[PDB]
Amino acid sequence: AGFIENGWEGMIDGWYGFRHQNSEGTGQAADLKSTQAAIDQINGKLNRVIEKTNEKFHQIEKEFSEVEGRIQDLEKYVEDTKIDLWSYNAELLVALENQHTIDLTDSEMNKLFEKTRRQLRENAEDMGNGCFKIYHKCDNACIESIRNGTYDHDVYRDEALNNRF
Amino acid sequence: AGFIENGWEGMIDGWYGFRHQNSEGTGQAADLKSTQAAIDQINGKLNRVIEKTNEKFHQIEKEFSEVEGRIQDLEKYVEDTKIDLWSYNAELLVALENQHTIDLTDSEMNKLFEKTRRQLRENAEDMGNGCFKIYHKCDNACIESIRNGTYDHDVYRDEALNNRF
Amino acid sequence: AGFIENGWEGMIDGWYGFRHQNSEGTGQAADLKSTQAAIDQINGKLNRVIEKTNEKFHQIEKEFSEVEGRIQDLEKYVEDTKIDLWSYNAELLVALENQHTIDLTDSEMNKLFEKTRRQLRENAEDMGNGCFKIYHKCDNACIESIRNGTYDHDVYRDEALNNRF
Amino acid sequence: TATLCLGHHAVPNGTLVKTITDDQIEVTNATELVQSSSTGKICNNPHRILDGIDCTLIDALLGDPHCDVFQNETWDLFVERSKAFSNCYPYDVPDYASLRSLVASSGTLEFITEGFTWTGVTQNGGSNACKRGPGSGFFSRLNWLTKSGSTYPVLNVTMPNNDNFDKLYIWGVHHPSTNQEQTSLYVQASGRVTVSTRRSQQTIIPNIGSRPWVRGLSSRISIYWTIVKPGDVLVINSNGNLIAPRGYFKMRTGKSSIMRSDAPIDTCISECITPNGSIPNDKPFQNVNKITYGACPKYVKQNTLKLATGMRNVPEK
Amino acid sequence: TATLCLGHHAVPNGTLVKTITDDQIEVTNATELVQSSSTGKICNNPHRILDGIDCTLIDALLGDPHCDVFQNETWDLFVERSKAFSNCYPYDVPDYASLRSLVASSGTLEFITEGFTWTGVTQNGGSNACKRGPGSGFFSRLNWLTKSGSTYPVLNVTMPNNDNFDKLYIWGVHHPSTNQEQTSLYVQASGRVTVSTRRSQQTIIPNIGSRPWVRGLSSRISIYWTIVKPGDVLVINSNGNLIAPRGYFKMRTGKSSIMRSDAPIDTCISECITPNGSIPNDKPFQNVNKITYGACPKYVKQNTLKLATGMRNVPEK
Amino acid sequence: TATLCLGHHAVPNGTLVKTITDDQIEVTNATELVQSSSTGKICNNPHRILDGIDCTLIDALLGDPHCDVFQNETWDLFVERSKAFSNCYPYDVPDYASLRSLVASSGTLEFITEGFTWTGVTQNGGSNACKRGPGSGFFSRLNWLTKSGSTYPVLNVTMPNNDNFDKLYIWGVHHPSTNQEQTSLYVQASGRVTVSTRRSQQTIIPNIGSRPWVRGLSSRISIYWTIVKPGDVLVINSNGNLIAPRGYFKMRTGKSSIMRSDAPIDTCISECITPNGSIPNDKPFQNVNKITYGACPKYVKQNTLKLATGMRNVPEK
Ligand SMILES: *[C@@H]1O[C@H](CO)[C@@H](O)[C@H](O)[C@H]1NC(C)=O
Ligand SMILES: *[C@@H]1O[C@H](CO)[C@@H](O)[C@H](O)[C@H]1NC(C)=O
Ligand SMILES: *[C@@H]1O[C@H](CO)[C@@H](O)[C@H](O)[C@H]1NC(C)=O
Ligand SMILES: *[C@@H]1O[C@H](CO)[C@@H](O)[C@H](O)[C@H]1NC(C)=O
Ligand SMILES: *[C@@H]1O[C@H](CO)[C@@H](O)[C@H](O)[C@H]1NC(C)=O
Ligand SMILES: *[C@@H]1O[C@H](CO)[C@@H](O)[C@H](O)[C@H]1NC(C)=O
Ligand SMILES: *[C@@H]1O[C@H](CO)[C@@H](O)[C@H](O)[C@H]1NC(C)=O
Ligand SMILES: *[C@@H]1O[C@H](CO)[C@@H](O)[C@H](O)[C@H]1NC(C)=O
Ligand SMILES: *[C@@H]1O[C@H](CO)[C@@H](O)[C@H](O)[C@H]1NC(C)=O
Ligand SMILES: *[C@@H]1O[C@H](CO)[C@@H](O)[C@H](O)[C@H]1NC(C)=O
Ligand SMILES: *[C@@H]1O[C@H](CO)[C@@H](O)[C@H](O)[C@H]1NC(C)=O
Ligand SMILES: *[C@@H]1O[C@H](CO)[C@@H](O)[C@H](O)[C@H]1NC(C)=O
Ligand SMILES: *[C@@H]1O[C@H](CO)[C@@H](O)[C@H](O)[C@H]1NC(C)=O
Ligand SMILES: *[C@@H]1O[C@H](CO)[C@@H](O)[C@H](O)[C@H]1NC(C)=O
Ligand SMILES: *[C@@H]1O[C@H](CO)[C@@H](O)[C@H](O)[C@H]1NC(C)=O
Ligand SMILES: *[C@@H]1O[C@H](CO)[C@@H](O)[C@H](O)[C@H]1NC(C)=O
Ligand SMILES: *[C@@H]1O[C@H](CO)[C@@H](O)[C@H](O)[C@H]1NC(C)=O
Ligand SMILES: *[C@@H]1O[C@H](CO)[C@@H](O)[C@H](O)[C@H]1NC(C)=O
């Protein structure tokens, strides 16, 4: 895909979208449904989904000015144990969350692509670069019909198949 | 997909399956191989895969009736630390397990779809609603052949391609 | 896929690759880009990505030769708590890491397949067994062109479409 | 042509679960992972449960007259009740909690009487604060030694451990309310009690004075203990105020413990005991209590956790 | 024909994050999950912050003349400073740390004077080591009892708890530098102090001898405490060296604590306090300190953790 | 036409791993994450390992005649052996475990002799229970003071810390077996030992009586310690039973520790030491022991954990 080859530095009205070329020239528009879906999943994740702030008050002493022996050794041990475990949880959590963010945003891109491909049916071919070659004249009203989910492939097959084969 | 648009409240003989319409009327049948595969993965997960019950006996005191000072402060601290960490593990684990259940069951649905699509080859088109339009007459024996993995696309291409193009 | 039906015990020059049959006979070659990508992800994961060795020195006593009462009970409790939590982390981590290894290597196989399918475009059909049937004569130079990403589908469509339809 | 539709089942009413990417997603089925309730009763199987009815473990250990039924008793779990009370000569146990832990984990009150010989003293003194039967009495496992005639010798007694197990000795020190009691009771202006082994020693000095009145007495007894290992020797040296051991408790290791609970005990089977009663152990987590015994679910803060047991539920509409 | 291209946005300069499969991947946006800095100041809201300026909590408890401003004071967090110093009769507190913890968590120095009657002794003795105003003095919550005329009776005083809360009593024991002080101060060759309740007792024996000189004195006072619950009784018995209580501190339970910090306090609002000052609590983790109070982020070793807030950044080229 | 087949490799014999969705899945390759074995030997590099052969750390500290080889010795790890034994005047250390921890973490027995002057007493007393050479002796770092002629004065000695480091003083108290020993040894019916600093004091009262016989003696010595910080002062006051310090141990901070092990030490290099011997540290987890020192893998319960290093293995058939 074209979305593997690169992203668009020129797209500022959304995260995912369409770019096109036809007889009326070129243009661009964001897809707001896939943009919002990716955003909602992320905003949820950045919030307190599996963790929250706990309020704590009186606790053990963590710093000492004197050498005491066994009790102090245990208090230090307990605190170091707690820190190592929370530091671990923080590494694993961030790597898992980042792994899921990359995967959900790549998936939203692929979903838009498959969604488009099945709307077009046999009237278009996948060029291997994130683009569909549409085999019939498709003007700006047609491109918007594809973009908003109303493209009717049955009014184009007679032309599109003649151009494909 | 049709499996995104909705599920079937009328399907009770399995989790995944087929519904069809042909010259003999309509019908429905569950796919038992994908149903069982999803079930086996889930039954494993609901079992002691990454966790088990531990048997514990004598332990520290966790409740106190008197104000003692340092030792009691440490005992409470140790127990609160343990609880916060296990409560965290429970949230992360359940959210991860649920994330994997949704993903494995969506994937089993998509696998059945791709499996069907390649059996049909060029004799059918993906309509974008979880359905394949079969371009040749396909009676109830044909539908079962597709369902049990024995459909021979080479005996239909001559008809199916004439109807597609 | 053919990569679901089986792997190749005869492939030793990489992890992923191609096998072919044409007018010049048969052959095999590994795909080094997908082989290295899978390896790099794994070598990273097998390294200290979310965990590292900590160096520890003086610590609490963990074994006792006498019955002491409360302090010893707390020291044992603290150590058992630590062990149960790290044992849990080890089970969850290994199962998650193995889940990701299987998923990334299955995905690299599917990526090579889709990559090949879009290079071939309409000049080949997916046979449902990890193989593409190429509908034009494709000699050893052609097969290498497909393998190294330089296949030009536009010089074959006139032949390939006549053989497909 | 024909249409072949692929899909999956749905249910009229699903349930909500949480995932990494979604806060609430409806699924066909979900199970509950937190056990949030108990039966309110403690099961007497498979574990051996010993209901201390009005006794604490220490009163049972010392031999309080109301706890005579617990002599040589065993348990996997000793259960203390909020109604428990003491009714004997007033006492204290420095580091009470450790003695309670030692005895609870040993799991037995098996007691073996030993031939200690105390000469020049009067043996078996009692009090009206610890009545046994119609008259005065004392703790059944202790021997209150007092003067004989007009004297009280220094007692020096040796009791070797030639056995193959550890012996637990319980002993104590009397604390008179006045200077006029200590010299009429054991004829000594300043008593001391020293108990020792080949590895450690404890020396206790009695403290004279009035404490608040408990059961008619302003005086107190302090309880101390020592453990003698095989090959070691117990030596007791005193010149007054000795509440002597009568023998030893046999120590054991194992699964035994102690819990505080007012829950009743019944004829049922359960591997997990909490102070709110027994709970099922078929879920990985519980939020019934933090205090548990046996094959129990992990304690968590959450009252509920739903684990999807199926796919997303998408109704037909 | 026409071309319809699908894609996603990119940014001129993205940021790197870590995943399970990749050590460094560039993303369009990422946020920071570790709070690594403080304002350097402690906020005085919403928590009640009590700056002990040159006082420690124990000096404020005992009544050191420089800490007279903390009488009947309350706090959610008591802040000790490195500049704090003592300036009164030299003292020690066995298990200092526990007393400091008890008072800090109670959260108050509310003190109620009680009608203790000490007969046959001289009340309110002081020292030039604890000047109050131009002359000698002592800790404001303690009463140093000495001989009266030529005698010192055994003091036996009873103070019952008929209230519905726990009472904390602070008392101590004097340790003279010489045999020539103890018999001129409280006419007694061997003093003892016994303080007791219906459940426990403490008996302290004074230790005669010279210690290093502190503020001109080679003598010391040891501080002890006891808690009397409703229905219980406080009894004090002594034949010399008693630094008597003047009443009790009212005990409370709650969110109160203590911290050591040299950070200044200001007019700002923050729920999380560390010894380096208040920090924001809008991130799940912090690496400012391990010592925290209030609604704080978890302490981690990492100085930074980046969480992707967007997709992979793939520049146009 | 032509056929182009895509696929991946397989191996004749793969290995099984566990995933989230599968309990056992065969993969081409897998590695082991738990180190389950040791060499049975302790490596003497890179850490400095000190084999106490028949000594414990405390006997080495005190100066037991068999431990004379450990004077002024240092270690990163002190290794105690099960064969270690004491052979000197019988002793006890209240809170033994804390002293053992303090010395072990300091990492040195460097000892500096100080000019303590003890007047009116006989210095350097010994016993046949601690023979040194052919005659009687004592612990090398302690000074047993006894009467001189017919008297024993109260000793009052001051030793200031004008250095820039902490000084550890080890001292003790003698406990005679009888009233007929204490008045012939240090002419005193009731001895006391008080050791103090500007911040704390310890007063010990000797306890007279026979203990079980150890090496021919029914008497005992108790060991106590104190730490003097720069600017502070050590003061010792006694009227009998003082086992005097001869100087101080220099305290240090660092990586030093102590372990109990019967494993031999050899000429190899390993960063991780367990009591079963050194182990490799190239795996994240180990199940060799819970007691570890240095750059060690985490201890887990599992004997094995397999991490896939490759893809699913699907044989040709
Ligand atoms: C989609 O776009 C076309 C062309 O602009 C318009 O006629 C049609 O009404 C739009 N449909 C929807 C659902 O917005
Ligand atoms: C599949 O179904 C057809 C039609 O019912 C039947 O003839 C065929 O034998 C079945 N094959 C298998 C493998 O069950
Ligand atoms: C791909 O292979 C063909 C046939 O061997 C060769 O002519 C061509 O130069 C190769 N291209 C690349 C990029 O290696
Ligand atoms: C779903 O549950 C609600 C109660 O929460 C009930 O009123 C409703 O009838 C149920 N619907 C179905 C389809 O079972
Ligand atoms: C759904 O799970 C519950 C357990 O919570 C079980 O009782 C019920 O039988 C399950 N239902 C189905 C449809 O499997
Ligand atoms: C307790 O067991 C010992 C075992 O020797 C026995 O001598 C003693 O009589 C028993 N006591 C009771 C109360 O059964
Ligand atoms: C000491 O005070 C108590 C009250 O607690 C009283 O009962 C007792 O008789 C008094 N004794 C003396 C020595 O006067
Ligand atoms: C039982 O659970 C309740 C919470 O509902 C708790 O307050 C109580 O302390 C528990 N039982 C006991 C006696 O610990
Ligand atoms: C990216 O950041 C660097 C500084 O780290 C700066 O020099 C460069 O100009 C920036 N590039 C863009 C496109 O903003
Ligand atoms: C990216 O995240 C930061 C927070 O670190 C935020 O301030 C910024 O506005 C975000 N930018 C975009 C493009 O959303
Ligand atoms: C402290 O509060 C008590 C409450 O009864 C009051 O009697 C006393 O005078 C108050 N002391 C100060 C210093 O305000
Ligand atoms: C004891 O030694 C101190 C020095 O610490 C000295 O000031 C004091 O006068 C001496 N007292 C006696 C009893 O000689
Ligand atoms: C503040 O942070 C620093 C680390 O930069 C730490 O050394 C210091 O101890 C912290 N503050 C206090 C007074 O604890
Ligand atoms: C696989 O291992 C078994 C022993 O567990 C051995 O007998 C068998 O020959 C091996 N097979 C292959 C193909 O290496
Ligand atoms: C498989 O992993 C092992 C380590 O357990 C390694 O020794 C071996 O060389 C690896 N084999 C392959 C095929 O990479
Ligand atoms: C130990 O070190 C000190 C350092 O001043 C030295 O005086 C002393 O003689 C040394 N002792 C031994 C046994 O080497
Ligand atoms: C005290 O008993 C011991 C035996 O432990 C004995 O050796 C010693 O001589 C006895 N001493 C007295 C005071 O009779
Ligand atoms: C060495 O491992 C064994 C378990 O096989 C354990 O029993 C033993 O205690 C360990 N070594 C030591 C001396 O701690």
Residue numbers in the entry:
A (entry chain F), B (entry chain D), C (entry chain B): 7 to 171
D (entry chain C), E (entry chain E), F (entry chain A): 10 to 326
Sentences from the paper on this structure:
HA is a trimeric glycoprotein with each monomer composed of a globular head containing a vestigial esterase subdomain in its lower portion, and a stem domain17. Each subunit consists of a membrane-distal polypeptide (HA1) and a membrane-proximal polypeptide (HA2). The HA1 subunit is comprised of a globular domain (residues 116–261) formed by an eight-stranded antiparallel β-sheet motif that includes a distal shallow pocket corresponding to the receptor-binding site, surrounded by the five immunodominant epitopes (A-E).
Notably, we obtained a structure of a fully glycosylated Sing/16 at 3.9 Å-resolution. Both the HK/68 as the Sing/16 H3 proteins were purified from HEK293T as well as HEK293S GnTI- cells, in which N-glycans remain in a high mannose form as they lack the ability to undergo further processing into complex-type glycans. The cryo-EM structure of HK/68 was resolved to 3.4 Å-resolution and is highly similar to Sing/16 (Ca-rmsd of 0.68 Å), demonstrating that the overall structure was maintained over time despite a relatively large number of mutations and the addition of PNGS. We observe density for core N-acetylglucosamine (GlcNac) moieties in our cryo-EM reconstructions at all PNGS on both HK/68 and Sing/16 except at N122, which is within a well-resolved region of the protein, and N8, which is near the N-terminus and is part of a poorly ordered region of the protein. Of the glycans detected, however, we found that HK/68 possessed on average 67% complex, 15% hybrid, and 16% high-mannose type glycans, while Sing/16 possessed 49% complex, 9% hybrid, and 28% high-mannose. Difference maps calculated by subtracting the aligned endo H treated maps from the GnT1- maps reveal the full extent of the glycosylation on both structures, highlighting the nearly complete shielding of the head domain on Sing/16. N165 is the only conserved PNGS present on HA’s head shared between Sing/16 and HK/68. However, N165 switches from being mainly complex in HK/68 to being mainly HM in Sing/16.
